[PDB]
Design a binder for this molecule. Structure first.
Ligand SMILES: *[C@@H]1O[C@H](CO)[C@@H](O)[C@H](O)[C@H]1NC(C)=O
Ligand SMILES: [Ca+2]
Ligand SMILES: [Ca+2]
Length: 272
């Protein structure tokens, strides 16, 4: 295992967003050309084991632990999100759940602040939304998914999302009802794993839905806001109610929020 390994994301210009938005309320549009300097991205979502090395070193107590509750999806105990007392990264469905059998799965119940603490501890940082989307797209232009426009290319599952009738029945057809190991599923063109699906991923940007079509260079998002941007979708997503396992998709939460489907990966200017 090399679950803290990074890959070099090459310098380039890409189209961020889409002029064919699918969730218009989320500011997926307009498409805009964005220039990104070469940098490094974690190949994997930060795992339980890797987060435990952080906590072992620093003694860090996560915001969910201090608050004393976190949001858990009802189907694994909106109306299907329940604030559960004693749910946190070590007990992802509440006090009598454990991570001992899933050490290689993504860490969950981590806030934006928790993520920044981890990444900075590791000599890294969160990616910006633009870096994240560029990396997600994996060197392809204007495609829905890291791998192209088909959800199941060659009849193969390429990401851990939902199959079945949400929220009642997850068939587990793709091989995972909850999370999968951080190295599950094929990599995209840049060597990134589970950049769509599995856990949602925090980014550094303040959220807004108002974007210019101006061209930009290493954009950081707006200078203020109340919610931070998260990307990529999770194991809960299904086309029927969600459609957020697209690189262009985007959503938000307050920086002190935490949930059973939300995690992160780090980036860095140079190798730490
Ligand atoms: C964290 O520390 C505990 C107790 O010393 C140890 O048993 C465990 O293996 C450590 N975890 C990691 C991921 O290094
Ligand atoms: Ca699944
Ligand atoms: Ca993910």
């Amino acid at each position: 295992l090399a679950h803290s390994k990074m890959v070099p994301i090459p310098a380039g210009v890409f189209t961020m967003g889409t002029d064919d938005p699918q969730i218009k309320q989320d500011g997926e549009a307009p498409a805009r050309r964005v220039t990104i300097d070469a940098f490094y991205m974690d190949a994997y979502e930060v795992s339980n084991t890797e987060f435990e090395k952080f906590v072992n070193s620093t003694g860090y107590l996560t915001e969910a632990e201090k608050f004393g509750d976190s949001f858990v999806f009802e189907g694994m105990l909106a109306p299907w999100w329940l604030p559960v007392k004693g749910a946190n990264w070590r007990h992802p469905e509440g006090p009598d759940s454990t991570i001992l059998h899933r050490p290689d799965h993504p860490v969950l119940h981590v806030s934006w602040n928790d993520a920044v603490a981890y990444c900075t501890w590791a000599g890294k940082r969160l990616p910006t939304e633009a870096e994240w989307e560029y990396s997600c797209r994996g060197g392809l232009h204007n495609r829905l998914f890291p791998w192209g426009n088909k959800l199941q290319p060659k009849g193969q599952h390429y990401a851990n999302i939902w199959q079945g009738e949400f929220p009642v029945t997850n068939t587990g057809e793709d091989g995972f009802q909850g999370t999968a190991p951080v190295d599950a599923f094929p990599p995209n063109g840049y060597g990134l794993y589970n950049i769509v699906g599995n856990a949602w991923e925090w980014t550094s940007d303040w959220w807004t839905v108002h974007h210019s079509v101006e061209e930009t260079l290493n954009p950081k998002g707006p200078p203020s806001g109340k919610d931070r941007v998260k990307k990529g979708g999770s194991y809960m997503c299904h086309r029927s109610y969600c459609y957020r396992y697209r690189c262009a998709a985007r959503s938000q939460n307050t920086p002190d929020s935490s949930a059973s489907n939300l995690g992160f990966r780090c980036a860095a200017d140079r190798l730490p």
